[PDB]
Each structure stands twice: as structure tokens, then as C-alpha cells.
Write a protein that binds this ligand. Sequence first.
Ligand code: SF4
Ligand code: SF4
Lengths: 71, 71
Amino acid sequence: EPRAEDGHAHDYVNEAADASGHPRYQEGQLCENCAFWGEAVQDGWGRCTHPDFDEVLVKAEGWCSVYAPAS
Amino acid sequence: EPRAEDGHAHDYVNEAADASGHPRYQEGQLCENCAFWGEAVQDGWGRCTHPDFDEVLVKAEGWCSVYAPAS
Ligand code: SF4
Ligand code: SF4
């Protein structure tokens, strides 16, 4: 699938540091340690199970406002 | 806490101007200059001491029909 573009859904960012001034954002929060992290695919990219990112590839070091701590 | 969406309570808008249609609205009126404002908790977002806004965060440039001027 095509790689996700900043702002895709929920304020998505390919560079979590970029989500900085977001009230919900916390240091340490990445698509990688997210409860929506499907599996890795190619060169930092992976799949997000959250229904909203079903047709794009997302980035390991990225972030979105729908972020939940992995269990 | 979570950010407050538009219409949360008392005609709430995260962007003051949007309320230009309210009888109680006046240019220059903002959460940050409101008596119920409990200051920025996060960057551009603060607390509201009004019980109807107690679970959420409100926005410095927002406005609610229960606005009260402050010093
Ligand atoms: S839900 Fe989690 S994994 Fe999916 S894009 Fe947002 S932060 Fe990344
Ligand atoms: S009462 Fe309304 S205008 Fe005043 S701070 Fe709370 S949300 Fe903003």
C-alpha cells in the first residue's frame, strides 16, 4: 500500500516529534508502541489496525491522535 | 484530559469568530480572558472552572455562551 502522508487521519505525522504541540501527545508515543500496530512491512513502514488507516502504510516513528498504549 | 469539541456545552466553539451569530458574543471575548479560565495546562489549551466543562480541556481562542469577563 501507498505510504501515509502527514495529516492522513487524526493529525497523522511520519515524525512523531512533529505532533509536539498536541495536547494528547506525550514523549515515547510512536506508531511502533501503539496498540494499533499491525506488523512491520518495509523500511520503517508498517500497518495500523485502526480502521482509519486501512489503505495506507504508516511509519514506525510516526504518531496520530488515536494513539493507545500497547498492552 | 481530552479536548473539547464544538458544542460541548453552552454553544462552545474552539474558534471564537465562529460564534459571531450569538447574541451574547462580542468581539474580543475569549476563554483566556474569561473569568472561568483556569490557565493553560498544555500549549494553547486550559481548564474551565465551570462545572459544565469539567472533564475537558478548553482552547485559549474558544468561546462559550456562559462567558464572564474577567480582569
Ligand atoms: S493509531 Fe497508533 S499505530 Fe495507528 S497511526 Fe495512530 S499512532 Fe500510529
Ligand atoms: S466558561 Fe466558556 S468562555 Fe469561559 S473559559 Fe469556560 S469555555 Fe471558555
